[PDB]
Design an enzyme around this catalytic site. Sequence first.
Site, short mmCIF file in Angstrom:
data_model
loop_
_atom_site.label_atom_id
_atom_site.label_comp_id
_atom_site.label_asym_id
_atom_site.label_seq_id
_atom_site.Cartn_x
_atom_site.Cartn_y
_atom_site.Cartn_z
N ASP A 76 122.37 13.11 -13.98
CA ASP A 76 122.43 14.52 -14.18
C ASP A 76 123.80 14.71 -15.13
O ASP A 76 123.66 15.66 -15.78
CB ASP A 76 122.78 15.27 -12.72
CG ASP A 76 121.61 15.60 -11.84
OD1 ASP A 76 120.48 15.94 -12.54
OD2 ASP A 76 121.67 15.15 -10.52
N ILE A 77 124.77 13.91 -15.14
CA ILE A 77 125.93 14.06 -16.07
C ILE A 77 125.51 13.66 -17.46
O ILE A 77 125.84 14.78 -18.23
CB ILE A 77 127.02 12.96 -15.42
CG1 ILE A 77 127.69 13.54 -14.13
CG2 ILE A 77 128.01 12.88 -16.56
CD1 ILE A 77 128.49 12.74 -13.56
N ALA A 85 119.65 22.41 -12.11
CA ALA A 85 118.42 22.90 -11.55
C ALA A 85 118.33 23.22 -10.06
O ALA A 85 118.99 24.14 -9.56
CB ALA A 85 116.87 21.86 -12.17
N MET A 118 126.56 22.74 -16.76
CA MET A 118 126.06 23.20 -15.62
C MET A 118 126.78 23.92 -14.56
O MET A 118 126.34 24.08 -13.40
CB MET A 118 125.13 22.15 -15.10
CG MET A 118 124.17 21.35 -15.72
SD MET A 118 122.81 22.66 -16.46
CE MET A 118 122.74 22.31 -18.29
N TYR A 161 119.69 21.10 -7.69
CA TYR A 161 120.69 20.43 -6.81
C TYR A 161 121.98 21.36 -7.10
O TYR A 161 122.21 21.88 -8.12
CB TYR A 161 121.16 19.11 -7.44
CG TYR A 161 119.99 18.09 -7.72
CD1 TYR A 161 119.37 17.55 -6.51
CD2 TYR A 161 119.73 17.75 -9.07
CE1 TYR A 161 118.39 16.61 -6.89
CE2 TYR A 161 118.73 16.96 -9.40
CZ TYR A 161 117.91 16.04 -8.28
OH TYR A 161 117.13 15.28 -8.55
N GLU A 192 122.29 13.81 -18.90
CA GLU A 192 121.39 14.47 -19.17
C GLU A 192 121.42 16.21 -19.33
O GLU A 192 120.57 16.80 -20.08
CB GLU A 192 119.75 14.04 -18.47
CG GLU A 192 119.64 12.41 -18.68
CD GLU A 192 118.34 12.03 -18.37
OE1 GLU A 192 118.16 12.20 -17.15
OE2 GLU A 192 117.70 11.28 -19.02
#
Lengths: 656, 656
Positions: free
Chosen positions: A303-304, A387, A312, A389, A306
């Site tokens: 997540d970090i 998204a 985000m 999370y 990408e």
Amino acid sequence: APARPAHPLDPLSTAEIKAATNTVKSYFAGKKISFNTVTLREPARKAYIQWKEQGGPLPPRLAYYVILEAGKPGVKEGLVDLASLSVIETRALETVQPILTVEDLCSTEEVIRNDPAVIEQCVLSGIPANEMHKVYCDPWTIGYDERWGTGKRLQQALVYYRSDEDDSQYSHPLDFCPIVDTEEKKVIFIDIPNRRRKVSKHKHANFYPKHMIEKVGAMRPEAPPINVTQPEGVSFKMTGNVMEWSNFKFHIGFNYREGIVLSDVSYNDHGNVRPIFHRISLSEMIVPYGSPEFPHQRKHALDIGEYGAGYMTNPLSLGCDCKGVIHYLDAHFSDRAGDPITVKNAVCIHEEDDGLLFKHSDFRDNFATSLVTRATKLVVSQIFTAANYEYCLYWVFMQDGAIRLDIRLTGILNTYILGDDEEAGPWGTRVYPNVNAHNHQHLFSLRIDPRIDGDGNSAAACDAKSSPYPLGSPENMYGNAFYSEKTTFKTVKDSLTNYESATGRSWDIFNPNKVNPYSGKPPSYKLVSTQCPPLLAKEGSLVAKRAPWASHSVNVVPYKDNRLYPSGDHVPQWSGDGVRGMREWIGDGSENIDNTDILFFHTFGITHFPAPEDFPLMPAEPITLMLRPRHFFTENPGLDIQPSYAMTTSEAKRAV
Amino acid sequence: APARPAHPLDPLSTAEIKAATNTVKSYFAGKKISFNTVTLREPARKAYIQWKEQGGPLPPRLAYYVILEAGKPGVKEGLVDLASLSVIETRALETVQPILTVEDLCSTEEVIRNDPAVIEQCVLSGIPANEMHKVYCDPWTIGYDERWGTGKRLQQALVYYRSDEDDSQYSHPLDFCPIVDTEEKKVIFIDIPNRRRKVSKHKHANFYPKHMIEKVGAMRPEAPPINVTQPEGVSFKMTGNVMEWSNFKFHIGFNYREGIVLSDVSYNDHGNVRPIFHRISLSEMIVPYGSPEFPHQRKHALDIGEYGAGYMTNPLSLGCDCKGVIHYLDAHFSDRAGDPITVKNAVCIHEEDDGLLFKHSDFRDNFATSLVTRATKLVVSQIFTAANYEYCLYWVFMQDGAIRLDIRLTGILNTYILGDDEEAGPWGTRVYPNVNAHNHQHLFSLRIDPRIDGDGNSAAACDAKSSPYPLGSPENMYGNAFYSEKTTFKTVKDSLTNYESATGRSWDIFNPNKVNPYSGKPPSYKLVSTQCPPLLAKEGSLVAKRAPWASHSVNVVPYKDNRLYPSGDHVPQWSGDGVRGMREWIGDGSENIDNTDILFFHTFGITHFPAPEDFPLMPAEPITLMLRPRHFFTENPGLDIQPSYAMTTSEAKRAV
Ligand SMILES: [Cu+2]
Ligand SMILES: [Cu+2]
């Protein structure tokens, strides 16, 4: 030239961003380019410390950029010297793909809603062709798909249906997965399962008050308030981004990727200002799912790297996200056009009650002799949404000198469709009719660049062990003897260690050049961390290859400049083959890490087996780790804090 | 007869205590007796549930007593029927010793100060004969010494020196250990080391403000206040000792030994009141030290069974120990004369903000579509002091239906003397000159009597595991597949399990008679607990024998009445030989525990390697475990709580 910052670690201002993007547009004049990343290139560690502590040279103020160019594969990246408004380093990377921005996530829905092949699959799935405005997608990176590699920039559109715009879509996943070329704005492929599953006919599983009133009859009445006030202000002091609180001093930075970056962390020990960490942050994540069925192997979000804990991050929410008296910081990035964008109130800073710091009373006068001192903690926080999370990140400083990282996971489960007679187990859970929430882990890589009481540090595993002498021996007559076995890491290979419940393993980051005058041991900060899952994906798997750091709880490597991101600088669509990131830094495992400049990367997190309690919106799940001073001080560093209540033995006798 | 309580689980009132002791004194008229314990004998589990849920018989109100009689070995124990003021059961136990009360701790100093052999040892140690008023002791139970067994009631006087009554004595231990007959009030032996170490000539290591001003120059200024108010009152409701809060309902009990006992714990699921636990408490502890040198094997305090979390509980603040708006309960016991004694404000109950309960936002409108709800937690707490130790105990109820136990350890290290040239390691740490703080563990036995959604329960280990199929197989093509392996315990033997970091082991307590309509799994509460040290003392050691429960993280046995205390009913001076306590309950391991009435005993805690930060007073060290609903509910149970902020997609579009 843009005005230069108060502090070399300050993030790029809006003006600096614009100055960087103007520079880069001029360098690439006549080319059609778009901006992916424009961010501070932090000064070299040596240069920073020399500037800060040695009256050394002012480090140049530099911007790192990543751009795409229409009709060219991959990316270009480089550096801008802000003072001279010039590109000073540039290169083309034709075989990598970069982080996806908010703009990139928002762009895919219009593509898929207008694509004839997607429309056809919506119809086959039971959604009529004139209801495409009801089709939504979470457009993850493809992650990795061996049919395309990095040859196109790709998203996988995880598709859902909303009956009304205010629905939570995750009760109504569709069965198929469009593959989208992010830069060409076109669907290139659709993964279609062998067994089709049409859209759920159930009601959406909704969670706003209006929905809940329909579902359960009524909301609970508002509870009576708990009010928190600081009528004389706060005890912390900020000078720009520099924090001072309870003898700690440090710089609060922020970037598109890591989110919060804490730097130049010291503790003022009665006038002796002692370094602890040069830099601490979250450097990567992986969230690997546990269904083997195609195409679900592509769900392993880093997540970090990408999406970005900065990109985000949420604008936090006047008095709701952070309760009490708050100091906010804003975040600034570039959009694709090269214009600065602002996330307001991205970071919250406040102090909060933290229960008791210490207490002791004497039984001899029925506890009349007593001292109690309450704790205050300082919290530096953000919340990012990737998204589905939500990750709530709290960096916490404590009055015993410990530093903790607390995370709360919330948001919504990633869901896939489940047929009426289809079993979800063993790889997922039926959390609602026709909803399969797949098993997954959430793993994080904490990056510590230490300077424990100065430079020249080492790390060790600490294992509790029974004495090797048996019960009944002269050395261990009653069988009770036990000690802490310290294994100091000499080479990188030695460091590659997991948490072990059998020894209650902790790790020390210590300065072998110094000695505590009481205990005789080196000053240290000890990592106390037990939420340390093994990586469940097999050796040699896609997951294991793309996250080489995640296969050990601890990885310690030599410091070099620009060793920030342990799955490489451009994560999306890397196959995991190659010597980059942590795999590069480990090398052949033979480099020295004893008494030198080291980087300590810790893998921690949770393994999530969904249950219905998690749906349609999940209650916060906590993760924590702490770095505690051990042998750093010669006594409890909080004893000069005024107690909340104190009575000595003499005073108790005088009260009669 | 005394007035009957509001509720069968209410602790004995002061009037009931007196009624019980009058009854016992009359039964033993002509005998010289003293009271050790006078406490509620709780109703049998069947009888309580039948009374509560089935219109059944009112259980008799009974008092359990333990008495000593001058000139007779051991104890006598029995039951008093309060309604008839009569002894209904009695027996003599000539070969056990009972819990040490506050009065018993306080009595030893006058004995040792007046004993000629002890005086002589003080003089040899550098303390003149006319300074015995400066000699103090912590008079632990002897614990176990094979020279005397249970044949006399014995304390070991861990001796210290104070230069002034206001000093913290623990910087100045002496080298010898008097052994005291508690009931005869005489020293019967002194353990003298082969190596004499005279009293430290250093200053005391002190911690009140007056001391710290001398030591470091000044106290820190008072910080600006953080004020917590509830101007419209609290959301919880108490009816006597019965609590109602956020759909939970339970009874708050208290006794001399366990301290807080939570009983009859249910959750009101939209009108369906569902049982969760019949009873939950801490049932025993062991704090084993890791120096093999004589007489340090005798330091392995079973704090609950040897001193008592109720007997040793602190009268709390007010305003200092528990911050905010507090409901207090008092504790009532008997003294040796049979008179009721009160500890005022022994339990504090309050609600506190607990950060975020859940949040989700939609990236599509830059997080404008958002819902955030804040959590409140309900906290039932006490603090007990066992000589040097403080144990802060917090039972926490949460709005997602989870229940947590949080402990903070503080107080003072137990210290022994260290010679000027003596090395403390590997068994301890030099935390101050001439002070050795030995290694030890703090282990706790959490006792859960469950009724998960009703009667007939089972327990299981849950282990995360990779799929057994290899990478590249049709079943696991990309090597990512993983699942939760559930091992349901069929017999006692199956349950004897440890925490395993290799699988991230958790444990389920579930109802195999019921099924979640969504997931298909049974309703459960899952124990999520990772501070689960191995017991470091060897098999067959004194520690391992006296604490049979501590050698596994989990022990599950059939329920029977009066199976509370897993190191036996009378702990001090038990050698650990014999079929009693947990060893009796385990038996040969073959009894059924699947779908029956079970007792779940969990061992958790920490291994403490002292450091100077811990001295002269230790900063709080946290321990936690959680019981989480999994498959209990069909959705997040908190979604009817009013959000702190909520904006839907449609509302966001209308705000422009
Ligand atoms: Cu998850
Ligand atoms: Cu301890």
